Symmetry: C5
Subunit: 197 residues, 5 copies
């Protein structure tokens, strides 16, 4: 089996519109901040660029790689992808990078889109020594905690040295929203502690 056969077999068994679950699909999400482009302390809005490292398992994709490549890049339109959204986004995610994921032969998927997006978050203290804490909430838009679970995994490693801002700290913790409109939806709450240089 070569890469074409692996992609062909992924298309036979992949159901892009069907969650590949008695138990939730465990989605891992971790943000690497690349840039903070604009901050508005009057409107409490920030424009950021981040790599959204997203992993999950889909065992329907698995193949025997004893005599064949054990990983391929696949367009995400061929795969089920978690319907993750930033709950406090005030613009559409601008995906800056090719929309390809890596599929490993055991069914593990890795997707790392570079996203530019505007958020509503607390920008107070951005001009002080201890900085602002901007919380970004990412979770399934339409799958509750029994269908999708979300778990978090240096902070400045890929952060642009040319930003007007610097990162003091990033903490990623698991949370839960119930709204009366819609059971409980799990999210990762990413606390970006940043200040002006």
């Amino acid at each position: 089996a070569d890469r074409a056969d692996i992609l062909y077999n992924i298309r036979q068994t992949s159901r892009p519109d069907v969650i590949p679950t008695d138990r939730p699909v465990a989605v891992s999400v971790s943000l690497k901040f690349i840039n903070i482009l604009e901050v508005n302390e009057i409107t409490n809005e920030v424009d950021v660029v981040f790599w959204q490292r997203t992993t999950w398992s889909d065992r329907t994709l698995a193949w025997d790689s004893s005599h064949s490549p054990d990983q391929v890049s696949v367009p995400i339109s061929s795969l089920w992808v978690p319907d993750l959204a930033a709950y406090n986004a005030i613009s559409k995610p601008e995906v800056l990078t090719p929309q390809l994921a890596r599929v490993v032969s055991d069914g593990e998927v890795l997707y790392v889109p570079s996203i530019r997006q505007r958020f509503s978050c607390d920008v107070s203290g951005v001009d002080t020594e201890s900085g602002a804490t901007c919380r970004i909430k990412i979770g399934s838009w339409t799958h509750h905690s029994r269908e999708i679970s979300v778990d978090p995994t240096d902070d400045s490693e890929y952060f642009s040295q040319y930003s007007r801002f610097e990162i003091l700290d990033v903490t990623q913790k698991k949370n839960s929203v119930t709204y009366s409109c819609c059971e409980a939806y799990e999210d990762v709450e990413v606390s970006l502690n940043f200040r002006k240089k």
Copy 2:
């Protein structure tokens, strides 16, 4: 399993056909949850808002026996009929910020809650006073009259503190959602709408 449910939904779903049951109007429920007010122009009477547009209706063609299978799935809206709702006083296209998936329940109930950013022409006078501005947003079927689609509010009366970001430079005083009817001189029939009154002011 979920694949069978999605497959069967695609066999019977007709995305371009209103799913009327015995020639009754399709009863669409619409309720806006304001999340943010981004820009307000008192000179041009224009507001830019983000809201969750909670939308429900029934399509019994979708129904399935869930006695031994999941009773709900997430389905891309391109696989479903969706009501052709428009904001009659919008001055921009609805920007949908979220994945375009609806929940289908096994009895045929559909729930769709897109997060939308949209600009409106509405009354911004009083925004910098204690009693605030009242911006009315009119949402209804663009092309289905009252005998094909009926539109009802969920919650009539609310202050939306459940949903509205306290990081906005605006605060919400009151949201009232009431049913209305427009007849235009284009057409003899009436189009039903929900009129959402957003009472808000600058902090």
Copy 3:
């Protein structure tokens, strides 16, 4: 026949890319702009940004069905229909369609399409801040069908439709037919000239 059968039959006989001429008469298209809002006016650059309902009607007899025991009207996505290739000659932006792209088809073949459009125009903005106002002329016609294939006809002060929250008020809208020969082509192209007389409140 139910609504699904009507849509199915419309897709069998509808030819979206073929002008539905009957016995090589032109397709009679009716066009009427109902101004909803005037959003930006620049007296220096002579540019206006407006929102209008472009009320468009025509007949396509290929669509007709027997409605004696069935609904006599349906909403159809415009991608399933032939639609006239109308363009605003003096537009300086693409038409931004704000509304769902569905038309109503009546069982005799009459089609009604009313998109809400936001669009920028190059037109005469002089006098906008005076009592008699500006007169901004918008020219709409078929882009590629001459007068033997498409005829365009108008169907007012527009107080029914125009937002009282605009900074502008409408004094008058007049819609008049024209027929122009262009240097590319020997045939005449029909247009409606819409004269929007408006001023600052």
Copy 4:
């Protein structure tokens, strides 16, 4: 009838294949009619213009016997091969303002006239003087060299409401070898001589 002509065009039309006949280049004619000059920045040397790009070529794969049938139809350009023309000094994507339909004549001649709004990098110096600015716009095939596509050139529709007036438009042909490739690429250079109507 028109439906049969469109049906036959869809049988033989290859939108992704240049319709060269034997070894011969497809002869593309391009001529710009300027409609508006909207924004001019003399500091950045950038202009925003609206023009009707009159484009003609032959595709004999489309040709049909019109002795008993209409000799012309409007066809969506997605059903046709269209030359891959690009403005080399454009700094924005062409905004096509008009329905994307071409006229096909029964002998295979195609006429396509999109109304385009586009921003260019060009010489705006002199715009506020009597002699005006000369903005050169360079258009040619992006991926077909001179043996596959040849390009030849050929105020009437200019808006009276522009802040600018047109003094002169000249179109000349050029043929350039670029360091990517051993073959020559043809372009038309359109020289728009224009000036501000006001004082400064």
Copy 5:
């Protein structure tokens, strides 16, 4: 065989979503930027808007055809071909492709793709109004193919607009190979250093 037959056969054998590696060798992708314009420079935000032709070449032997009796090159829409998933790591906008998305395929399988791209970057704009100028570094490589699947290898002002407010002093292109914390394998990039200043 005519051009229609060549396109038809390319569609039979082309797998647009499958990297055309031969026997576990990386696909050798060649990338070289020709700068056309520097449009907007913000010295406060360290952001620049540039236009460049991204000259991109690789081999895909699945596309090869016998050209003894037929043209040996055609223009093909890139949606019919595998194209390397190149990304500019320090871009802060999507690439705006200004040109028709057609590549040239030679009968031996060589592909040439030269999109004209307008894109905004986060890079060092300090010194732009001085004699030695700013150095804006643009980092391009495969987003999802590591060094064993894709390798990337590299006259500056030749196509640069004389009407820009900026002039180019120097362009250097160097190869790099980076391991990122997601993944055990190395990703290749070209780092393009654009040294420019205000006229």
